């Protein structure tokens, strides 16, 4: 049905409760409330919303940028899955060039071979994405 | 030679001078000072400590704990590289998970084929990783 309460939600996806209700509060995902109880509830469509903000979390996209592609009168969501794809493959291969060079790094290590400094840093990209924060990606 | 500059270090890694010096200041990646113009120099065993702690944080540790990782008595790299590699593969497999849940929503959103809740959410992971903080996987 269209009434999924909250932890439901948080239990189906992996998502905390803190979490949702932050998209809530933001505007990013936005349930009805439940005329007898005052609960939120999710519907089927709140929870392919959820899905593809997920694609665009595991991809690095900050919350505001995800909200405006959402949220654009233009949305065309079998467009935006593809795009999405493709971002996904790439981030896919470039995992793929990093163990790569990860194994050549343990022959390294061993002696087996020796490699150069640009050996070394093969597959690490943190320029690939603009919307990308240095420190996310490499601080604390 | 084991004199390369923070300028040179930052080219070749594509990590920031303002990152090497946050690595510098909190003493996890601490390069010796030139005698003559005072300015960081970075040794090869310099280089190869920043390529591991860039494959700790394509995995996710916080810096405070590829720290201590890194400064531990009993650091074995060869043992440390290894559990890295099985790590890295393990994120491989679940954007390959990732990647086939999107390819079946492609065709959910077209109408051949119709999902349940769980298949949608089939890859995603946010309880492998124990450092990992949620807001920073999912918020902004």
Tied chains: 1, 2.
């Excluded at 505007?27 to 709140?46: A, H």
């Amino acid at each position: 049905s269209n009434a999924m309460q909250i932890k439901e939600l948080a239990e189906l996806t992996g998502v905390s409760v803190r979490t949702l209700h932050h998209y809530d509060k933001i505007g990013l995902l936005v349930p009805q409330k439940d005329d007898w109880n005052g609960y939120r509830i999710y519907s089927e469509k709140d929870v392919d919303k959820l899905q593809q903000i997920l694609f665009f979390k595991e991809l690095d996209f900050p919350l505001k940028k995800i909200q405006q592609i959402l949220d654009d009168p233009l949305f065309d969501k079998n467009v935006a899955l593809d795009m999405q794809r493709h971002l996904l493959i790439e981030k896919k291969q470039r995992i793929e060039t990093m163990l790569a060079t990860l194994d050549l790094t343990i022959k390294n290590e061993k002696g087996e071979i020796t490699m150069t400094n640009k050996e070394k840093f093969t597959g690490f990209d943190f320029s690939s994405n603009p919307y990308e924060e240095e420190a996310r990606k490499l601080w604390g």
